[PDB]
Amino acid sequence: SATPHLDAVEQTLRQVSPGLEGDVWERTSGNKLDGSAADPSDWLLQTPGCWGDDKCADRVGTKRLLAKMTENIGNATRTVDISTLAPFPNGAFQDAIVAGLKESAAKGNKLKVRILVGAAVIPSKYRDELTAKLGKAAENITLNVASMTTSKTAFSWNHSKILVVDGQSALTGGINSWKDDYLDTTHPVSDVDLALTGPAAGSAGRYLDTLWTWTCQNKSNIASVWFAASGNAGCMPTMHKDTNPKASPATGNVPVIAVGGLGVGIKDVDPKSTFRPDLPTASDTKCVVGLHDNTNADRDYDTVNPEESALRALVASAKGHIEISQQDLNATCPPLPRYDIRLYDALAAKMAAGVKVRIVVSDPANRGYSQIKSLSEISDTLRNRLANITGGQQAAKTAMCSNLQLATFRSSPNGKWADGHPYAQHHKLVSVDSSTFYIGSKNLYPSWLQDFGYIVESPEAAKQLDAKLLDPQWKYSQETATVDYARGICN
Numbered sequence: 456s457a458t459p460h461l462d463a464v465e466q467t468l469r470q471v472s473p474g475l476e477g478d479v480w481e482r483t484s485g486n487k488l489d490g491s492a493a494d495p496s497d498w499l500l501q502t503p504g505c506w507g508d509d510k511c512a513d514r515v516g517t518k519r520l521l522a523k524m525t526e527n528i529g530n531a532t533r534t535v536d537i538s539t540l541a542p543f544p545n546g547a548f549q550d551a552i553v554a555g556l557k558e559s560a561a562k563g564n565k566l567k568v569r570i571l572v573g574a575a576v577i578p579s580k581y582r583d584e585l586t587a588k589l590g591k592a593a594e595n596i597t598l599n600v601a602s603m604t605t606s607k608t609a610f611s612w613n614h615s616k617i618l619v620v621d622g623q624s625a626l627t628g629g630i631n632s633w634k635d636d637y638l639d640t641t642h643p644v645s646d647v648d649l650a651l652t653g654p655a656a657g658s659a660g661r662y663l664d665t666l667w668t669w670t671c672q673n674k675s676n677i678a679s680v681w682f683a684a685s686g687n688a689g690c691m692p693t694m695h696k697d698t699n700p701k702a703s704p705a706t707g708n709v710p711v712i713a714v715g716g717l718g719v720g721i722k723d724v725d726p727k728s729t730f731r732p733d734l735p736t737a738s739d740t741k742c743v744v745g746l747h748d749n750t751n752a753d754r755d756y757d758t759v760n761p762e763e764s765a766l767r768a769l770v771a772s773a774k775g776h777i778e779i780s781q782q783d784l785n786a787t788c789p790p791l792p793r794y795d796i797r798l799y800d801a802l803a804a805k806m807a808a809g810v811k812v813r814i815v816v817s818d819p820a821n822r823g824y825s826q827i828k829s830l831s832e833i834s835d836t837l838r839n840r841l842a843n844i845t846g847g848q849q850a851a852k853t854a855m856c857s858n859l860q861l862a863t864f865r866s867s868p869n870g871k872w873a874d875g876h877p878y879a880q881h882h883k884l885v886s887v888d889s890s891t892f893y894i895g896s897k898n899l900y901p902s903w904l905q906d907f908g909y910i911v912e913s914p915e916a917a918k919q920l921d922a923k924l925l926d927p928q929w930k931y932s933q934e935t936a937t938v939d940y941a942r943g944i945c946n
């Protein structure tokens with residue numbers, strides 16, 4: 456096969472969540488990573504994109520991100536579909552949305568627009584702020600704005616960050632539309648989105664229809680949903696299905712698996728699934744006896760959260776090397792378990808077989824864009840899982856030290872930004888074999904939210920990701936490594 460990694464992930468997803476194929480996960484062909492002619496790698500919407508500079512003077516990443524948001528929205532002829540984590544978009548993120556909507560209206564288009572946020576009077580206020588800023592362009596727009604929480608007890612709400620236009624173009628990734636953390640700051644958060652076009656943008660629209668179908672059903676339950684619309688417009692549960700072609704047009708030759716999760720409180724199980732997993736013998740992940748652990752000890756949760764299995768399968772598909780860039784691998788316990796046991800087992804299995812693993816996380820000095828005190832909380836866990844498969848602790852340490860790079864993130868030679876604040880990173884990135892990668896909103900640390908992302912198999916694109924993000928990251932981050940097989944570092 457030309458696509459061994461997607462083939463493996465797809466086989467796992469059809470066993471885990473067959474009933475959700477099409478809507479919460481979907482494999483498509485014929486996509487394109489949507490870069491410019493001048494800089495074909497700039498489908499990779501990293502921010503701030505100021506490598507080497509502790510003052511972050513020339514934010515080529517941020518500039519491209521905002522321009523691409525505006526460009527995509529400005530090309531809308533039918534629909535604009537946005538999801539994010541509250542607060543609602545502000546600053547130049549909001550400016551980009553308003554500019555794009557005005558541009559589409561001026562080209563003569565009438566648009567349907569949905570903006571959904573997850574949260575713990577705000578929607579009506581955002582709607583009114585937006586309508587005011589649109590001026591006469593607002594007459595051409597049917598707007599739905601909503602904030603939602605799907606489970607209070609399981610801390611579940613939307614965490615996806617998606618911008619889909621006409622079901623044809625999609626931007627998604629880790630970037631929340633928060634000006635103070637990303638933009639108006641001399642210590643900007645480092646993160647990444649991707650831009651694509653093609654059938655996979657349709658997959659995102661079907662995912663958002665899934666969320667809005669739940670949201671509209673629960674729109675009168677104040678504890679769950681706060682909803683606001685323009686004029687006398689109703690809630691639009693199936694805007695994508697109703698407005699865009701079921702199969703989006705092809706734009707390229709890139710194969711993609713879209714995958715998300717429904718968290719807790721939308722759907723309890725995929726009734727079509729006959730998935731029956733081997734539970735790992737925990738470990739020390741559940742800090743307290745009373746916590747219900749959806750990550751490690753809830754088969755039904757897996758079936759409505761295919762993204763967890765997809766990311767573990769992506770790791771399992773690697774033949775040579777795996778790079779992981781995250782805010783964290785571990786969560787704060789309580790209320791979440793500290794780590795995903797199956798994920799750490801999958802990483803251990805790969806290191807035991809000589810596949811190299813790089814993990815870069817956000818500096819614990821951020822703890823907050825960090826949930827650990829020390830990198831030892833990651834290496835100790837990996838070592839302990841390795842011990843189960845290498846015969847003991849000494850052999851585990853040897854395997855780990857021979858095959859691991861573990862570090863905290865920097866983007867320049869300085870240990871912190873020039874303003875004295877630590878670097879914060881927020882990527883949700885996994886790449887394998889310079890071939891296949893995930894960019895999306897799903898953190899690898901335990902989390903029970905609605906999330907979404909893309910797994911792309913394209914060595915060309917993967918090589919661009921290496922040159923533009925992963926290689927510069929390791930250039931500056933390697934100085935903090937506690938383990939680095941390539942330099943014989945083993946602490």
Ligand SMILES: *[PH-](=O)([O-])[O-]
Pocket residue numbers: 540614629631896898
């Ligand atoms: P996310 O926006 O919490 O990772």
